[PDB]
Design a protein around this nucleic acid. Structure first.
Lengths: 146, 32
RNA sequence: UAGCGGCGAGCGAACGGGGAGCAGCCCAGAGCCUGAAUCAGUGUGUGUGUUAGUGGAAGCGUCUGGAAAGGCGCGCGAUACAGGGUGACAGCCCCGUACACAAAAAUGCACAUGCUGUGAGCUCGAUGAGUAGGGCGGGACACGUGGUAUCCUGUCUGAAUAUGGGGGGACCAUCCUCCAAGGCUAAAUACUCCUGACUGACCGAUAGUGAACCAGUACCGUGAGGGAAAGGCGAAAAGAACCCCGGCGAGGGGAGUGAAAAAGAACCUGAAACCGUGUACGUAACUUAUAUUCUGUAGCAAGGUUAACCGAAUAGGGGAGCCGAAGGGAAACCGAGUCUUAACUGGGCGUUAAGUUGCAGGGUAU
């Protein structure tokens, strides 16, 4: 399965065993309940739940991937204009290296959050229905989730 | 709290001057 | 867990592994040259705080309304949608929030600078003296002074300087370790009277500290000490100007302020045991947690799990434990079979019968 970019359709190959596996409802529910209670978590089951939620999100067509999502300058006006052009309001931006301009001009957005690959959490993914994921972050998330 | 302890009868008893003052007054200052 | 305990009630190890840190020196005495390392003090310099503070982005119409901070529309801000206040719910009304900043003077933190104090450093001696040990009577765990096995002595003794002396369960063959009998130590390691900030799926006036209130107050006792009860007007007191009935009292009855006076100072909301008015009816209380066991569910799967630790930190690094694997017999030893027996179709235990960590809950004692 190749992610839709809407501009170039240059999505890279994604391991279906990780991003396209069956959705285990019980495991995801257990992991989210444990995360809510904490806010014991095991590495393997946590990774499995992350893979399950990623597979559910991609299979629901709620995930969008672009070559590089960022802002030219650290201004919230530019980000708002870009979101308006995208015609989306509640979007979770996930990337790799922590962007400076976007992170700086993203705090005030109540319905928009920005985080890096290492900072992905089940609560963040579940909170926002739509996710915009940077292309380069695919390998990072794959290695993080094994 | 400090008055109850520092000026309490316990502290006065612990000191010779406190005992002398208490005996003189009996013949006071803390009421907890 | 081993161990201990009229082996009954019960108490309680070592080794090792992995982390923060890991600092060893001083002299006991000689020389060489040598106050050049390091530490404190003193005046100056730089950067950072603190003790006061500065700038700080964006809006209105209509309708509902006591007030709009209610929602309807079209706009903008954002490195600032943390909060508080404004006649009801505020990113654009105000203090502030991100950010940029700010000091005549003092100190704290880092070093450099001139000077004063401990004062680079190199080589060669060298062991900390009445010391190890012994004897009489005492003090501590069992002594109740000798289970005396350990420590100290009022007292009498007492050959060691890396040839020698200490320990190693007897001494001992192999050997392991140090030069005890002089001193220092700083980092990681607990505690919180009290101060700054952050909060809480914390409490709501019979709750919460005893005290949300002039509370450690009244009061109870000569004293120690004990120890209460008591919040809510509203938006601005706008606190009812003013006429009259009353004792120039109070109390209320009118007008007015008022959204409300069903907010009127004995001041938000109002229910019964209690007393009347008006109407109708018949009537002379096993809590938290270690262990035991069970239920259903999820990941991995012969692996699951990593923990005090580190962690742009609840993700990830960190295998030391943690349950079992091709097994068992006390061992040899054999191997899918094995074990005392020459052998029991005796009989016991096995064949590659997969287990673990979480999730929510049920019974037992501790």
């Amino acid at each position: 399965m190749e992610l839709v970019l809407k501009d170039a359709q240059s999505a890279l190959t994604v391991s279906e065993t990780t991003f396209g596996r069956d959705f285990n409802e019980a495991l995801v529910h257990q992991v989210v309940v444990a995360y809510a209670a904490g806010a014991k978590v095991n590495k393997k089951m946590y990774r499995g739940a992350l893979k399950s939620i990623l597979s559910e999100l991609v299979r629901q067509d709620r995930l969008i991937v672009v070559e590089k999502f960022s802002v030219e300058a650290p201004k919230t006006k530019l980000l708002a204009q870009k979101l308006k052009d995208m015609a989306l309001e509640d979007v979770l931006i996930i990337t790799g290296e922590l962007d400076e301009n976007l992170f700086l001009a993203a705090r005030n957005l109540h319905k928009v959050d920005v985080r890096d690959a290492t900072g992905i959490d089940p609560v963040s993914l579940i909170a926002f229905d739509k996710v915009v994921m940077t292309a380069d972050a695919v390998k990072q998330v794959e290695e993080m989730l094994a | 709290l400090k008055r109850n302890r520092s000026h309490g009868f316990r502290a006065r008893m612990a000191t010779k001057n406190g005992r002398q003052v208490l005996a003189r007054r009996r013949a006071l200052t803390v009421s907890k």
